[PDB]
Design a protein around this ligand. Structure first.
Ligand SMILES: O=P(O)(O)O[C@H]1[C@@H](OP(=O)(O)O)[C@@H](OP(=O)(O)O)[C@@H](OP(=O)(O)O)[C@@H](OP(=O)(O)O)[C@H]1OP(=O)(O)O
Ligand SMILES: O=P(O)(O)O[C@H]1[C@@H](OP(=O)(O)O)[C@@H](OP(=O)(O)O)[C@@H](OP(=O)(O)O)[C@@H](OP(=O)(O)O)[C@H]1OP(=O)(O)O
Lengths: 247, 247
């Protein structure tokens, strides 16, 4: 269709040879909150849409997120995503829409009824670390900065393998998403990447609940249980790793 | 050692033949919060223990739980577990210990420092539904009541297979844990058990964030990534299912 928008993210696939099982593994990160929750809090829906449509949004939140919405306390909801990050003007605008959509019409009783009848729960995605380039930043510099910012793993732990680049395209209907991935190979021991997740590093925990080494079986297991398919990126990446090592 | 206490839970392993892939599957439930968080909120630790010991407790919470503790708002912490369940006397006693341990000495700055330096995150367990028998309740009646209470699946969906009983024993050092499992076979279609999780059913969402059919590969995948090993119960259960069907 008519793409009204292009959004480009650049990421890093960092791989390791696990010496105990001779299995290739890659760093993945698990998200802290669901897309549905984020979309609801930032009002990326239509209050005029039919009931069944708005319920699908609540169905794909986690139970804990729904229990947060059930409190009607927007600031407890907001904290769940933002964690006291100073974004007051965004906050006030999103609160105003929450208030008008759900508090002023009936002091929240339609919202509670929807929240109460939503069924099931969504899933927190596993992803490859990636982000938006800063102004006049090169693609590789973005992938490396983003990797460090999310995982705390610094450049002395890996070597970039520059012959590898993987691009992925997704189409929202108006937004085009471009994801560009470089490949890095671990050259220094790092057996517990999850230990880099601490609340004293606001950029690591901002959107991440877990960092783990994942082998291809796990990548396949995860991919079949979430909407974000990781195999088209990890498969080629591991193929490249195998050729790199076999030389 | 000297067991000072015996705790007995009775559960139900409910199985199905998935007709599309001819794979045997069992209902598992994923917990909503971590053991570490529960233990911290109910003060099952020693304030006198060494730093490194109390940090291990925080390490095994999830990031979202740590961010809740970081607020210093015991009632936001309490809601995370109890969700406005009326247990005020328990609440007041646990709050008193939280206040004395962490608020009165320095208004929470040691707690925040520990919370900030904790590293990593725990994992939400997958389990077989089970609970405590009520007074003068038989073992089977408990397993069936508990199953329905947690999952919303009623007796018309399955037949008990009475020749199967599996007992498991775990030893805390003073507490003995006895888990007794019956086996049931689905006799009526139920393709999306997770749709039974809604906030209007307080007993289903009280401790559960997800209900899913799980095949043996998934059971093995999960078991290798959590402290609670499910294979000693599901393996024999699926063996029994195969013999039941082959006759
Ligand atoms: O025009 P707006 O609707 O307000 O769009 C803005 C914005 O700045 P400009 O749009 O003024 O250029 C950013 O653009 P980029 O950062 O992509 O350059 C942003 O991106 P982020 O999601 O990375 O913040 C995205 O606009 P874009 O369409 O360029 O992505 C964003 O609107 P969103 O809230 O949709 O991001
Ligand atoms: O003696 P307490 O330390 O206060 O023990 C109580 C209690 O009642 P009694 O202990 O007065 O019998 C329950 O006992 P049961 O329900 O097991 O019969 C309970 O069990 P629940 O966890 O199921 O509530 C568990 O005591 P028990 O040692 O019998 O488990 C509980 O202490 P907890 O908080 O450790 O459960």
């Amino acid at each position: 269709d008519t793409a009204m928008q292009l959004k480009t993210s650049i990421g890093l696939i960092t791989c390791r040879m696990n010496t105990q099982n001779n299995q290739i593994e890659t760093i993945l990160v698990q998200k802290r909150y669901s897309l549905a929750f984020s979309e609801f809090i930032h009002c990326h829906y239509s209050i005029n849409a039919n009931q069944g449509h708005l319920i699908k949004m609540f169905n794909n939140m986690t139970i804990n997120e729904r229990l947060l919405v059930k409190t009607l306390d927007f600031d407890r909801m907001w904290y769940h995503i933002w964690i006291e990050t100073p974004v007051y003007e965004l906050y006030h605008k999103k609160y105003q829409k929450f208030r008008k959509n759900w508090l002023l019409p009936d002091n929240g009783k339609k919202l509670i009824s929807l929240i109460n009848q939503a069924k099931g729960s969504g899933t927190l995605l596993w992803e490859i670390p990636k982000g938006k380039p800063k102004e006049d930043e090169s693609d590789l510099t973005c992938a490396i900065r983003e990797f460090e910012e999310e995982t705390g793993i610094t450049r002395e732990y890996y070597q970039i393998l520059p012959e590898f680049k993987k691009s992925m395209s997704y189409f929202d209907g108006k937004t085009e998403y471009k994801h560009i991935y470089f490949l890095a190979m671990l050259c220094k021991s790092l057996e517990e990447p999850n230990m880099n997740l601490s609340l004293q590093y606001e950029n690591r925990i901002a959107e991440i609940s877990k960092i783990s080494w994942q082998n291809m079986e796990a990548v396949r297991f995860i991919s079949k249980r979430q909407s974000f398919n990781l195999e088209p990126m990890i498969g080629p990446a591991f193929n490249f790793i195998k050729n790199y090592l076999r030389y």
